[PDB]
């Protein structure tokens, strides 16, 4: 009838777009780069081990200065951390012990966590009277927080279990904008450097990038088999790294609009729990389920060096805005802060 | 915030007293106080702190053995225990908060404070200047030095520069010499390098006279600066 006639509209077009996609690609990225030198051998030593949380540890978010970081766990106990001396300069106890992410303020001011409450809680650290309190719970979800990002000190995005991306207003406390259009929960996302674009990983194994003023899907980038457990941004913003529960990872292009190398290895077999990328873009460090953390190369899809000793699960990674450290935070309440070095 | 203190009187030589400072306002438990004195027509001058929990207490060489800092969380409230007083121990007693991690701002409130009146290694901080004529409109730059090097090996050079308005407590204007304190305006500014410390005002208005501290932080006992005071 009418329905019939749309889905074959619909077929048709995802068939027209498929092979623009093919058309456009006229080579592939691997070949590309088989006469740059390789990274080599790449060592990191565990430099700290941020002991303290009594609980598996569930998200971290490094601070625009490169020093403090804030870290979740099922203790719920929200943890601000000084990397460079391992001190313990906040501990904010959560209303609700299940947390599934954390964000730092680019400002500094507010830290986020959220989890199956449904709740993305902002707490603000610099206050006169010295302590930390709850500003603003922000609710309206259906589902379990996921992870969630400040755009600016009064701009949150965010993503719930409800198949649905907000956008939130701090001062205000209603959803500004609301992203639609996954048919499974998402479960992360990855601001862009400029702050116009963000894109995020769902259970539809298909990661989709959107616009913060449009509200609409601009981009459904789609290579992925399995749930994306994590998606992150290149350092330049044209492209985007989705992780997943298939033990591979997907370097796709925001212009090119099409995968453009899948990082994957036989003897692994563990989903991709965390994803992050370098200062120069070059290494690209996952945090997987095999109580491992490989870094491969984002240019050439060979593994250079892991962090092997965390003896958990990878939940949670991070890099420095400078590039200095790389900090992953697993199941056994230990942070390790992590460099390369000589 | 608040801070209020009382046990100030006439107290013969020798005597002994009680100084309450109750804490009402914020977390009081989480905050360290000190304690600092100011003789009349001086300086300010250290007296003793004690750190948030009882954990670890320091006392000035010069009332060590005789003068004791108590905080009380419960009831929200401070003492400083007084015995064995002299004619030198006669001054405007404050009772100051201070909370200590990466990025705070310490000593940034101040007790109204009381007068008392008794009848009848260490840095050693300089200033070149005690009165400065002005007038609004223009810059101001104040003079500290130190005799060691307050520059440390992580990074941070502890600066802390006071205001204290005619007839009232002291006011935290700038620390670590380039962070502005929360409620500061923006035309004050710090610059240092180790051994010449500065503090810049961008543009005069009134409010801007007051006598001007300089503080050093890197080691106890704590000092104060000479005091640079400004008048129209």
């Known amino acids: 009838s009418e329905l019939d006639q749309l889905r074959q509209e619909a077929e048709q077009l995802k068939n027209q777009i498929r092979d623009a996609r093919k058309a456009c690609a006229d080579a592939t990225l691997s070949q590309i780069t088989n006469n740059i030198d390789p990274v080599g051998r790449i060592q990191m030593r565990t430099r700290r081990t941020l002991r303290g949380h009594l609980a598996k540890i569930y998200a971290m978010h490094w601070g625009t200065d490169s020093r403090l970081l804030v870290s979740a766990s099922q203790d719920g106990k929200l943890i601000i951390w000084d990397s460079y001396t391992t001190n313990k300069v906040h501990a904010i106890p959560l209303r609700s012990s299940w947390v599934m992410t954390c964000a730092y303020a680019p400002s500094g001011n507010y830290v986020a966590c959220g989890g199956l409450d449904n709740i993305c809680s902002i707490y603000n650290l610099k206050t006169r009277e010295g302590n930390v309190r709850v500003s603003r719970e922000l609710a309206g979800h259906t589902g379990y927080l996921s992870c969630c990002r400040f755009l600016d000190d009064n701009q949150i995005v965010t993503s719930s279990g409800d198949t649905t991306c907000a956008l939130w207003d701090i001062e205000t406390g209603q959803q500004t904008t609301t992203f639609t259009g996954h048919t499974g929960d998402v479960m992360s996302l990855s601001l862009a450097p400029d702050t116009r674009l963000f894109v995020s990983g769902a259970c539809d194994a298909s990661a989709k990038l959107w616009d913060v003023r449009e509200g609409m899907c601009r981009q459904t980038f789609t290579g992925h088999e399995s749930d994306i457990n994590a998606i992150c941004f290149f350092p330049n913003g044209n492209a985007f790294a989705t992780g997943s529960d298939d033990a591979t990872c997907r370097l796709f292009d925001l212009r090119a609009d099409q995968e453009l190398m899948t990082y994957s290895h036989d003897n692994i077999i563990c989903g991709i729990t965390s994803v992050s990328f370098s200062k120069s873009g070059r290494l690209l460090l996952a945090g997987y389920d095999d109580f491992n953390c490989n870094v491969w190369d984002a240019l050439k899809a060979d593994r250079a060096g892991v962090l092997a000793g965390h003896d958990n699960r990878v939940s949670c990674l991070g890099v420095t805005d400078d590039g200095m450290a790389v900090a992953t935070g697993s199941w056994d309440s230990f942070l390790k802060i992590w460099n390369g070095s000589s | 915030v608040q801070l209020v203190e009382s046990g100030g009187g006439l107290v013969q030589p020798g005597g002994s007293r009680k100084l309450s400072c109750s804490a009402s306002?914020?977390?009081?438990?989480?905050?360290?106080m000190h304690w600092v004195r100011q003789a009349p027509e001086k300086g300010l001058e250290w007296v003793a702190y004690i750190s948030s929990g009882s954990g670890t207490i320091y006392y000035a060489d010069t009332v060590k053995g005789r003068f004791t800092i108590s905080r009380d969380d419960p009831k929200n409230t401070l003492f400083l225990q007084m015995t064995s007083l002299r004619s030198e121990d006669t001054a405007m007693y404050y009772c100051?908060?201070?909370?200590?991690?990466?990025?705070?701002?310490?000593?940034?409130?101040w007790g109204q404070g009381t007068t008392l009146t008794v009848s009848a290694a260490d840095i050693v901080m300089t200033q070149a200047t005690s009165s400065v004529p002005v007038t609004p409109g223009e810059s101001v730059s104040i003079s500290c030095r130190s005799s060691k090097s307050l520059l440390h090996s992580n990074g941070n050079t502890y600066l802390y520069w006071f205001l204290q308005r005619p007839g009232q407590s002291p006011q935290l204007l700038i620390y670590?010499?380039?962070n502005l304190a929360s409620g500061v305006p923006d035309r004050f500014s710090g610059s240092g390098s180790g051994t010449a410390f500065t503090l810049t005002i961008s543009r005069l208005e009134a409010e801007d006279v007051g006598v001007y501290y300089c503080?050093?932080?890197?080691?106890?006992?704590?000092?104060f600066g000479a005091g640079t005071k400004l008048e129209l």
């Open positions: 100051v908060r201070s909370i200590y991690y990466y990025g705070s701002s310490p000593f940034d409130f």
């Open positions: 503080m050093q932080h890197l080691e106890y006992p704590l000092t």
């Open positions: 306002g914020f977390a009081f438990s989480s905050f360290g």
């Open positions: 670590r010499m380039s």
